[PDB]
Amino acid sequence: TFKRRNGGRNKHGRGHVKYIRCSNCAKCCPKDKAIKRFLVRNIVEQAAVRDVQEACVHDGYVLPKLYAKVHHCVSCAIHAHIVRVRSRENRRNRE
Amino acid sequence: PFTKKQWYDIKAPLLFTSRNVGKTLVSRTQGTKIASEGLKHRVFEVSLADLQNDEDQAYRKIRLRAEDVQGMNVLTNFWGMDFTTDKLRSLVRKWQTLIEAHVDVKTTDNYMLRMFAIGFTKRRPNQVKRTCYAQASQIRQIRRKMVEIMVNQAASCDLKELVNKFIPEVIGKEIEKATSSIFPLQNVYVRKVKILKAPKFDLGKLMEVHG
Amino acid sequence: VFGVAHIFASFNDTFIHVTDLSGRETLVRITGGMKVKADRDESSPYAAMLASQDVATRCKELGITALHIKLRATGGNKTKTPGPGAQSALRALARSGMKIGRIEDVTPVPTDSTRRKGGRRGRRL
Amino acid sequence: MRAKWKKKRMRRLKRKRRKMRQRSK
Amino acid sequence: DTQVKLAVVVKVMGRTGSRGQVTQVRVKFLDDQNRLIMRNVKGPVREGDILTLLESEREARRLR
RNA sequence: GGUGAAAUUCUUGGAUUUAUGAAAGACGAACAACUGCGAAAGCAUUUGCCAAGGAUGUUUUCAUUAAUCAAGAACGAAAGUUGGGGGCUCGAAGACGAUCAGAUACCGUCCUAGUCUCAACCAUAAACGAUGCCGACCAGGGAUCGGCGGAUGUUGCUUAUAGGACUCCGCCGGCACCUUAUGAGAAAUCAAAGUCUUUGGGUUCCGGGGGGAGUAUGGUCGCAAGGCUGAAACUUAAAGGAAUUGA
RNA sequence: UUGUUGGUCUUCAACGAGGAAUGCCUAGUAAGCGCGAGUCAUCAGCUCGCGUUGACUACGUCCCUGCCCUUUGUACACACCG
RNA sequence: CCGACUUUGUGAAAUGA
RNA sequence: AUGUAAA
RNA sequence: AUCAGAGUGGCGCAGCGGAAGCGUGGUGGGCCCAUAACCCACAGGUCCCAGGAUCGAAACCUGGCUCUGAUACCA
Ligand SMILES: [Mg+2]
Ligand SMILES: [Mg+2]
Ligand SMILES: [Mg+2]
Ligand SMILES: [Mg+2]
Ligand SMILES: [Mg+2]
Ligand SMILES: [Mg+2]
Ligand SMILES: [Mg+2]
Ligand SMILES: [Mg+2]
Ligand SMILES: [Mg+2]
Ligand SMILES: [Mg+2]
Ligand SMILES: [Mg+2]
Ligand SMILES: [Mg+2]
Ligand SMILES: [Mg+2]
Ligand SMILES: [Mg+2]
Ligand SMILES: [Mg+2]
Ligand SMILES: [Mg+2]
Ligand SMILES: [Mg+2]
Ligand SMILES: [Mg+2]
Ligand SMILES: [Mg+2]
Ligand SMILES: [Mg+2]
Ligand SMILES: [Mg+2]
Ligand SMILES: [Mg+2]
Ligand SMILES: [Mg+2]
Ligand SMILES: [Mg+2]
Ligand SMILES: [Mg+2]
Ligand SMILES: [Mg+2]
Ligand SMILES: [Zn+2]
């Protein structure tokens, strides 16, 4: 049985795609098969933004944001709930 | 342990509007451990906003180096140029393209330095296209223009006036107007300046630029 | 007067390390593991908060009045996310009464890494 | 990986069969 | 030296913990009627109750 | 430091952390995609040099010169082999710390060959689109990549336009995707797996129940590891594929 | 009679709140107290009912043990004790 | 192999007395 | 970790 | 052939006179649908044999019995 039409990755016209290291476990997986989330987070959750802006000496300092692009393998993506097992009918939704 | 330590005033040179970036401390002179000449090359890294009372330049981490010390004031000279992690990583996004260039440069005084520029292609208004990519032949042409401008917009006397170009982005805005006919190019800067080597001390040089 | 708190918040510990504005003089270096007994709680937010208050007292004993943050994860060819003590420690020296200047993440980022530990199949446990 | 390891069991066995035949030669 | 500080439960969030034994609440400090922080209470607790707190820096996270 | 928790290990001969500089060797983040190039394997830092290629454009030229292919030939990831060079990181083997009934494993520490390069071998991968190549016909659509053609209107441009960036339309050639049968199929699915009992476009390779077995033997290629060719005796009623209900 | 049972005197044992485990229970409830009925000639440390005194705790969760529905994987169908 | 003295003069600093 | 030969 | 060594719980082993245990194994409960694994307890010994001294011996000397290593050369 062929579960997916794309085979689990985006690879057309190519023969080889270079792998990447999973952030969680460092398993090697090809760059076109990995689950890739660009995370844009704050240095502090809104619990501690006022009591850190109370301490900024220069007025108007906006707290910078940590930027990262995190890679996962299939097993780590499933186990952390970044992606879920979907129904057969919902497997085809890419939005 | 901290009772044998004496503080100093760190001062930026006069082409920086504000001065007095802060205070450093050095253990007082002993045998073979002299405060004055013993250290002398502290490297300091202070925001360009703290340094010219202009938050409009909150990026551009200025790297500063102590050339000499005179009687409880650490006299500092411009040592480098760099972006915050957040600013550079704010600029770079998918569905765009990124162009990099670098060139080694001599000023008339013999500072050898690198400059790195970065630019990003601009979506024009009314675009319905989902991505904004130049072609590789275009990508090369812009990089070649980037390098040439660095060469000739540099090759100007010294970091005294050369830094005067780096501050208001005399280079980056001029990159766009230099080559707007090859592809738009928004967010042009000079991302980094690394000083490869400097000439000898030449004490006359310092106080002429320093306060 | 400004010092620089080279905060290293990895997993398994945390380092609250204050230096002068040149980095060449250490001023006070408390770590999470000096404040608890168990190796597991060295990275805890509480031990992180205890360390920072200890830092602040030793800083307010020395005349520096405000400071600059440099948050740091492990980086390199390992995680880029700061550890479980990052925000909790930062929330402490703000709630401790000493002031913050500018905040930057200085986690070491390769242009591309040497091979990472663990092998091709990764840590499978 | 049963089939792969079965291929290894043949590989080892066949090597030993060749060593016997050199001795008898 | 921690000073026992009083707060008031403005609102109740959920019932966290493996067995559900921990009601999570939002507290209102009486010295400064501005600090709304999460705390984790054991025992039946409604809004208008007053919690004695030894420390305050220990702040509960979302769904802790 | 490491972890589920630890321990091996390092440490007042100052470990870890912080800062300036140096060396070495690997790697080439983000940009980076249901995108490009290549016969496949494969191919991502800059610039220059050398030779090659597809597509598009053409009222250039030859004029059947072609398709596919036993024998024969070029290339062929990783590992592995022989010599040099290099030896950061990682790391088969090995050695330890944990765990465990045990643990020659997963986890943790240290590390050999190897990883990298030059010369020469090897010739195999789920080397996969599990789908040979050439040709025709056949259904609708929006994206996208390369070229070309057609439209005014707009720029941080441009001595002026013209071109370059962007918008719309068309053609050709690519990598794909979506919706649907009037089609096919055991079905899953497939716009090529369609134009099949209403069975014939050309051609190459290859299968004949499951094992024994890609084994024995002979040949042949290789330094070796091994590659290619490749049975039989015997045994057995099923093995297997797609889909359904339950557990 | 291998003492049906109820008396009287005498005999005065183990047991110092019970290890690893484990049951029932959310208001007239748990727990305490006794009564009636079944069996029955005699025998109630039992069961089925009854009333009397009368709380502590919780107003939740899916963690352990299980149940229902959905999605998903299966080489299971005497069905994972496969 | 190692130390002192000798060859063996000159003058400057830091901790030492 | 495992699960009648006793149908 | 002599001589060194060693005989202790079912087995492998420790035990310096006041004097008997370690691992594993046995027995009875628990956990499980049920076995292991895991949990809680319980019971073990002609200390090779016969002496002798010794406050007092499994140990210290003597005799007897059984297993093991040794050195036995110049001719
Ligand atoms: Mg499957
Ligand atoms: Mg192609
Ligand atoms: Mg491949
Ligand atoms: Mg396995
Ligand atoms: Mg150190
Ligand atoms: Mg491209
Ligand atoms: Mg790059
Ligand atoms: Mg090993
Ligand atoms: Mg093959
Ligand atoms: Mg095949
Ligand atoms: Mg066709
Ligand atoms: Mg086009
Ligand atoms: Mg097209
Ligand atoms: Mg047949
Ligand atoms: Mg057959
Ligand atoms: Mg098959
Ligand atoms: Mg099947
Ligand atoms: Mg009765
Ligand atoms: Mg309920
Ligand atoms: Mg599966
Ligand atoms: Mg069956
Ligand atoms: Mg089983
Ligand atoms: Mg068995
Ligand atoms: Mg078995
Ligand atoms: Mg038992
Ligand atoms: Mg049992
Ligand atoms: Zn992973």
JSON list of C-alpha atoms in Angstrom, two decimals, chain A residues 19-61:
[
{"chain": "A", "resi": 19, "resn": "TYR", "atom": "CA", "xyz": [20.17, 15.87, 5.10]},
{"chain": "A", "resi": 20, "resn": "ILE", "atom": "CA", "xyz": [19.85, 17.89, 8.30]},
{"chain": "A", "resi": 21, "resn": "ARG", "atom": "CA", "xyz": [20.17, 17.08, 12.00]},
{"chain": "A", "resi": 22, "resn": "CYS", "atom": "CA", "xyz": [17.03, 16.87, 14.12]},
{"chain": "A", "resi": 23, "resn": "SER", "atom": "CA", "xyz": [17.02, 19.44, 16.91]},
{"chain": "A", "resi": 24, "resn": "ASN", "atom": "CA", "xyz": [15.70, 16.97, 19.47]},
{"chain": "A", "resi": 25, "resn": "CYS", "atom": "CA", "xyz": [17.52, 13.71, 18.81]},
{"chain": "A", "resi": 26, "resn": "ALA", "atom": "CA", "xyz": [19.97, 14.55, 15.97]},
{"chain": "A", "resi": 27, "resn": "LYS", "atom": "CA", "xyz": [18.64, 11.82, 13.68]},
{"chain": "A", "resi": 28, "resn": "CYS", "atom": "CA", "xyz": [19.60, 12.56, 10.09]},
{"chain": "A", "resi": 29, "resn": "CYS", "atom": "CA", "xyz": [16.65, 13.32, 7.82]},
{"chain": "A", "resi": 30, "resn": "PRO", "atom": "CA", "xyz": [16.58, 14.95, 4.38]},
{"chain": "A", "resi": 31, "resn": "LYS", "atom": "CA", "xyz": [15.86, 18.67, 4.31]},
{"chain": "A", "resi": 32, "resn": "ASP", "atom": "CA", "xyz": [12.75, 18.18, 2.16]},
{"chain": "A", "resi": 33, "resn": "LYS", "atom": "CA", "xyz": [11.25, 15.57, 4.52]},
{"chain": "A", "resi": 34, "resn": "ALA", "atom": "CA", "xyz": [11.81, 17.29, 7.86]},
{"chain": "A", "resi": 35, "resn": "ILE", "atom": "CA", "xyz": [9.17, 19.21, 9.79]},
{"chain": "A", "resi": 36, "resn": "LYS", "atom": "CA", "xyz": [10.42, 22.81, 9.70]},
{"chain": "A", "resi": 37, "resn": "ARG", "atom": "CA", "xyz": [8.91, 25.47, 11.95]},
{"chain": "A", "resi": 38, "resn": "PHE", "atom": "CA", "xyz": [10.19, 29.04, 12.13]},
{"chain": "A", "resi": 39, "resn": "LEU", "atom": "CA", "xyz": [9.67, 30.01, 15.76]},
{"chain": "A", "resi": 40, "resn": "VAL", "atom": "CA", "xyz": [9.38, 33.68, 16.72]},
{"chain": "A", "resi": 41, "resn": "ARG", "atom": "CA", "xyz": [9.36, 34.01, 20.50]},
{"chain": "A", "resi": 42, "resn": "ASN", "atom": "CA", "xyz": [9.94, 36.64, 23.19]},
{"chain": "A", "resi": 43, "resn": "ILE", "atom": "CA", "xyz": [12.85, 36.70, 25.63]},
{"chain": "A", "resi": 44, "resn": "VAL", "atom": "CA", "xyz": [10.22, 36.73, 28.40]},
{"chain": "A", "resi": 45, "resn": "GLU", "atom": "CA", "xyz": [6.58, 35.65, 28.49]},
{"chain": "A", "resi": 46, "resn": "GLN", "atom": "CA", "xyz": [4.10, 38.46, 29.17]},
{"chain": "A", "resi": 47, "resn": "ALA", "atom": "CA", "xyz": [4.20, 37.45, 32.84]},
{"chain": "A", "resi": 48, "resn": "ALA", "atom": "CA", "xyz": [7.53, 39.28, 33.16]},
{"chain": "A", "resi": 49, "resn": "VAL", "atom": "CA", "xyz": [7.46, 42.07, 30.57]},
{"chain": "A", "resi": 50, "resn": "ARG", "atom": "CA", "xyz": [6.29, 44.95, 32.74]},
{"chain": "A", "resi": 51, "resn": "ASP", "atom": "CA", "xyz": [8.68, 44.20, 35.58]},
{"chain": "A", "resi": 52, "resn": "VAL", "atom": "CA", "xyz": [11.49, 44.15, 33.04]},
{"chain": "A", "resi": 53, "resn": "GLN", "atom": "CA", "xyz": [10.41, 47.35, 31.29]},
{"chain": "A", "resi": 54, "resn": "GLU", "atom": "CA", "xyz": [10.30, 48.96, 34.73]},
{"chain": "A", "resi": 55, "resn": "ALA", "atom": "CA", "xyz": [14.06, 48.31, 34.84]},
{"chain": "A", "resi": 56, "resn": "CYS", "atom": "CA", "xyz": [15.05, 49.55, 31.38]},
{"chain": "A", "resi": 57, "resn": "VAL", "atom": "CA", "xyz": [17.03, 52.77, 31.84]},
{"chain": "A", "resi": 58, "resn": "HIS", "atom": "CA", "xyz": [16.53, 54.03, 28.26]},
{"chain": "A", "resi": 59, "resn": "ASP", "atom": "CA", "xyz": [12.92, 54.89, 27.45]},
{"chain": "A", "resi": 60, "resn": "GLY", "atom": "CA", "xyz": [11.32, 53.08, 24.53]},
{"chain": "A", "resi": 61, "resn": "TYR", "atom": "CA", "xyz": [13.32, 49.84, 24.56]}
]
